[PDB]
Design a protein around this ligand. Structure first.
Ligand SMILES: [Ca+2]
Ligand SMILES: [Ca+2]
Ligand SMILES: [Ca+2]
Ligand SMILES: [Ca+2]
Ligand SMILES: [Ca+2]
Ligand SMILES: [Ca+2]
Ligand SMILES: [Ca+2]
Ligand SMILES: [Zn+2]
Lengths: 320, 65
């Protein structure tokens, strides 16, 4: 079937991505976004050019075979398209439509995943294709052009358990300089699921096209983003509309990719990750917080977090 | 068997330690001092007391959101 003519989904517009693309579409050589999910439809015409690495960690076995890394569910393909669908004549367009993606398959065809597989996936995003975290020994991993580590790890998934080996891996990612982004969860709970709940991870809640928080969105997130009626890529070489904090997550990861790409383009370095409390323009998370559209009551609140991410303003903050 | 994840002091642990209790090694992490192991459910308490073992944790589940 003939591909449909390109449209910009409402959520891409909401997070103020299109005005950034004249500065960068995310296609800065050193920047990769690792999406830990159900895999990817790696030949999708609106994704293929941005799929830089395709791997699987299912059952505790690292595989780089296309057959093993391919998406048997659809969710990963959707998430990836929100971040990085190509700006061209077909389909949709991602927040960062030129960013390299590492698709790391940690969830099976059912969309279920073991924590062990997820932790292996995070390890793989740090190690990159070359199997080595920090080749030159300088302590610089994310943002080091000699290494192939991802700069963003995006986890549109969650569970109730807090395990120390998993947290240890999250800590390794953080110390590598990797911004970690995760869905808050879809149970209408008072706080985010794991790994979103870790201090080193940006928890993302979901808003609808009326700027209301989705009723399912777990509360006390760090930021929020479009997560209801989200059109994106879907297998096979097609498109689908979904809801969930899994759909909000990639919008944030895309914004981070734009920030880091723009910052590297200008300065030849990346910004530090930052912390939940940061309200400066000196870290990624600080920039996300200060530029977010503060919905609901003034200030951080349990529904929106700091607010709805806005790529245009974030990138200006980064480059200012 | 069940699948668990063992945290260790790498300098005080050798993965062969777990074989005598029916364990087998699934994955040795490169970036954290831990190993994913398949073992008899009855042997979990045994792992906890092995040289270099700091913690044994169950393999939990996450789902797509
Ligand atoms: Ca395909
Ligand atoms: Ca497109
Ligand atoms: Ca590497
Ligand atoms: Ca390095
Ligand atoms: Ca270096
Ligand atoms: Ca990189
Ligand atoms: Ca607010
Ligand atoms: Zn086994």
């Amino acid at each position: 079937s003939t591909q449909p003519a390109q449209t910009i989904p409402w959520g891409i517009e909401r997070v103020k991505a299109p005005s950034v693309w004249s500065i960068t579409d995310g296609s800065v050589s050193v920047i990769q976004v690792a999406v830990l999910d159900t895999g990817v439809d790696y030949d999708h015409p609106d994704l293929a050019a941005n799929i830089a690495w395709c791997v699987s960690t299912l059952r505790g076995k690292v595989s780089t075979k296309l057959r093993d890394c391919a998406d048997q569910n659809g969710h990963g393909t959707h998430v990836i398209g929100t971040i990085a669908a190509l700006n061209n004549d077909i389909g949709v367009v991602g927040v960062a439509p030129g960013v390299q993606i590492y698709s790391v398959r940690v969830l099976d065809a059912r969309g279920s995943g073991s924590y062990s597989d997820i932790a292996i996936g995070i390890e793989q995003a740090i190690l990159g294709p070359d199997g080595v975290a920090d080749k030159d020994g300088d302590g610089i991993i994310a943002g080091d052009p000699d290494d192939d580590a991802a700069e963003v790890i995006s986890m549109s998934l969650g569970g109730p358990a807090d395990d120390s080996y998993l947290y240890d891996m999250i800590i390794q990612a953080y110390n590598a300089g990797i911004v970690i982004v995760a869905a808050s969860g879809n149970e209408g709970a008072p706080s985010p699921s794991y790994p979103a709940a870790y201090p080193e991870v940006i928890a993302v809640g979901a808003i609808d096209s009326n700027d209301n928080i989705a009723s399912f969105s777990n509360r006390q997130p760090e930021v929020s983003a479009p997560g209801v009626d989200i059109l994106s890529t879907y297998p096979d070489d097609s498109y689908e509309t979904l809801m969930g904090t899994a759909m909000a997550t990639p919008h944030v990861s895309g914004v981070v990719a734009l920030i880091q790409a723009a910052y590297y383009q200008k300065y030849g370095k990346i910004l530090p990750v930052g912390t939940f409390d940061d309200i400066s323009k000196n870290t990624v998370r600080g920039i996300l917080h200060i530029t977010a559209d503060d919905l609901g009551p003034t200030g951080w609140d349990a529904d929106y977090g700091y607010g709805v991410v806005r790529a245009a303003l974030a990138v200006q903050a980064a480059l200012g | 068997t069940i699948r668990v994840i063992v945290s260790v002091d790498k300098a005080k642990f050798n993965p062969h330690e777990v074989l005598g209790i029916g364990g087998h090694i699934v994955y040795q992490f490169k970036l954290i001092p831990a190993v994913v192991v398949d073992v008899p459910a009855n042997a979990v308490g045994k792992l906890k007391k092995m040289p270099g073992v700091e913690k044994v944790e169950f393999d939990h589940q996450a789902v797509l959101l």
